[PDB]
């Protein structure tokens, strides 16, 4: 239905750009994770290599060292942000199908970052509530990945503006939903896309008015915003 | 004279307008957007980077802390404010483009934000003005930050200087990486022919950045494609 869609103005660009500027650059290990997942039935929820480079990149410039991922799936962006960080970072990975992550932990464990990774086999909401409660200021985290249950993004997000460090980075994957965003009615969608196409259009506009953060939605893969903690 | 100037590189026009009015303007300083406005009625207002890539440069300085920067190519200072706005009260910019008078328009709004004093403005061409900061800088005044935005031949020539003036960690962005799309085929059939060299200079120097061990990257699809390279040593 949406899955089939880009939002750059042609497949030959978005192949040009994974060629020329993502595999050449993927590490091994990334790499066989993907190809792995990409014959996986949920290959659809697979972070697209060249957001993953950018992902990395953020890390890296920004220094973080401590990471909270929300949605692992195979643990594609999970594997990024591991090697990203200093052989020192922690990273707590929360996602609900353990059986999805252990698909790829093999290659995580070959890349040798497995120790970096705190995997929580949970829904996330309660998890973030709970380290509400049992965390103080130098807890806080760096970096958030938001990539779960889209409904589900504003309950995440007014945790994680506590949970992430002020001058923290929050990232909300697929904030353009495959274009259906644009436009107040979209014909067609199966209530799920529906629900969550709506869910982004509402968290896009609360986004841009949010004092606590600045953002800026930038359009690699299906989205990405970036929200900087501010107070 | 140039035809891909209007040639978006998402899929739809609303796409882009959507993210530009939900994302870009409610976000933008106003002294930004009195400059962009003025800009758009200019000659070559095609040059103006767009606003939803200046919030995307913005979120890049603060997050990294850059504190040192330097632009190369300012037309009339969309990301050269950008830049002055988000640096710190101390920050500095080296600001240089061939084109002083492109600058004077921008320049009262860059002064009513009161960031001019953080602005170093040199008219010149970049690749003199490199060859002469690479003879003079300590490791001290190293930049964390160099965005390139100027003639885009040139720019294999910029990145031999900007590996050597910008910090290990800094960042240097290369931007129009993608040419409107452009550089997704071999051959594009009815371009300037100044446009056709930029497309083929984009080509190599997008595989040569890709093998460039000096650097990692990250190509990113906002605005007309922005390469973001971070110096390994
Ligand atoms: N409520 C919830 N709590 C935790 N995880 C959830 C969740 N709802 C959905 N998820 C998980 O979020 C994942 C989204 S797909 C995420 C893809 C992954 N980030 C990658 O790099 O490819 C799914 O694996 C799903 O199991
Ligand atoms: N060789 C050169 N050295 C320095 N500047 C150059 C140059 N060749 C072209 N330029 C300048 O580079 C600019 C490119 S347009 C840059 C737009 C600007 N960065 C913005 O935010 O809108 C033009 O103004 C042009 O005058
Ligand atoms: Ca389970
Ligand atoms: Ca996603
Ligand atoms: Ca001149
Ligand atoms: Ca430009």
């Given at each position: 239905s949406l899955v089939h869609k880009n939002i750059l103005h042609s497949e030959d660009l978005l192949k040009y750009i994974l060629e020329t500027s993502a595999y050449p650059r993927e590490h091994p290990q990334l790499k066989e994770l993907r190809e792995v997942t990409e014959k996986?039935?949920?290959?659809?929820?697979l972070v697209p290599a060249d957001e993953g480079l950018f992902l990395s990149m953020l890390l890296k410039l920004m220094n973080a060292k401590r990471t909270i991922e929300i949605g692992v799936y195979t643990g594609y962006s999970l594997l990024t942000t591991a090697l990203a960080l200093p052989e020192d970072g922690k990273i707590t990975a929360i996602d609900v199908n353990k059986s999805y992550y252990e698909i790829g932990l093999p290659f995580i464990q070959k890349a040798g970052v497995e120790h970096k990774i705190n995997f929580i086999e949970s829904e996330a909401l309660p998890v973030l509530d709970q380290m509400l409660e049992e965390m103080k200021e130098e807890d806080l985290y760096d970096y958030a990945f938001v990539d779960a249950d889209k409904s589900n993004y504003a309950n995440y997000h007014e945790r994680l503006v506590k949970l992430v460090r002020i001058g923290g980075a929050i990232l909300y994957d697929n904030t353009l939903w495959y274009g259906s965003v644009a436009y107040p009615e979209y014909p067609g969608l199966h209530p799920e896309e529906e629900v969550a196409r709506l869910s982004f259009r509402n968290l896009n506009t609360f986004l841009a008015a949010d004092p606590r953060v600045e953002i800026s939605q930038v359009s690699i893969g299906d989205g990405v915003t970036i929200c900087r903690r501010l107070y």
């Open positions: 996986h039935e949920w290959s659809s929820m």
